Amino acid sequence: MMTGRQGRATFQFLPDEARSLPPPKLTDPRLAFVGFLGYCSGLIDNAIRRRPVLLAGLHRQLLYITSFVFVGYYLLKRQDYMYAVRDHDMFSYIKSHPEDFPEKDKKTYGEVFEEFHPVR
């Protein structure tokens, strides 16, 4: 649905306006999980090739972790941008059409009549 957005630069991974958003922290829980996935891929690499799982290829295990965290950082950066855009469009559209989104009239519970169904 968010394809022909008015504020848009097509075929860009991270448009310019995304730089005005806070970056994901290097201690982001999502980023730690992505790194943990890289480590799991390293162990499975040893297992399928009948190498010692925990020790063999520490250099290889290091690049599995780094590549996942490197790719994960940018995907998270774009994930938070696309959700910022959705809210930005949602709020702008609400201002442009106030009649469609009126301020609800609030009545206390002392006056609103709710039926009572006894449990007997």
Partner: protein, 174 residues
């Protein structure tokens, strides 16, 4: 004293004076003199020893008091922050009212045992109160269900009040 005497009333005790007629001795009287010397006094010595220790390092605990908060009738629909405090206050009062019915029931049971074979007459003030509170408790909290809440309590009251004002209105037209 331990408990407030007003909350748990007890009419004054009247112990009739002994008046022996037989020449034999009363075995209980001598046992009472042997129980109070080999049981009561030794137990009192230990307690007095224990009581002295407590007085050396007295420390207090207080009865938590809850500030009043707006009731469910003063909360806007779907206002969780205002509905949260109102609902929690209602739950506390429900617990308090449960114990009130326990205080009254405890008094009613005590009267039946204290008055003995004449309980069916001397226990008239308690039974009147017991029926008084139980009727009030039933109206406030009954048939609400396991998932009871302040909203359902408010709805039940509004059901009773409407059926009362309608009854009062149409009584004059009889």
């Amino acid at each position: 004293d331990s408990w407030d005497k007003d909350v748990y009333p007890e009419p004054p005790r009247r112990t009739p004076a002994p008046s022996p007629q037989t020449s034999l001795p009363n075995p209980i009287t001598y046992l009472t003199k042997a129980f109070d010397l080999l049981v009561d006094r030794p137990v009192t010595l230990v307690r007095e020893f224990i009581e002295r220790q407590h007085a050396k390092n007295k420390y207090y605990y207080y009865h938590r008091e809850f500030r009043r908060v707006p009731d469910i009738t003063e909360c806007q629909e779907k206002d969780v922050l205002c509905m949260f405090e109102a609902e929690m206050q209602w739950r506390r009062d429900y617990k308090v009212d449960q114990e009130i019915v326990n205080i009254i029931q405890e008094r009613l049971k005590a009267c039946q045992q204290r008055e003995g074979e004449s309980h069916r007459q001397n226990c008239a003030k308690e039974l009147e109160q017991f029926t008084q509170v139980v009727k009030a408790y039933q109206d406030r909290y009954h048939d609400l269900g396991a998932h009871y809440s302040a909203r359902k309590c408010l709805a039940k009251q509004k059901q009773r009040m409407l059926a009362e004002r309608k009854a009062a209105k149409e009584a004059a037209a009889a």
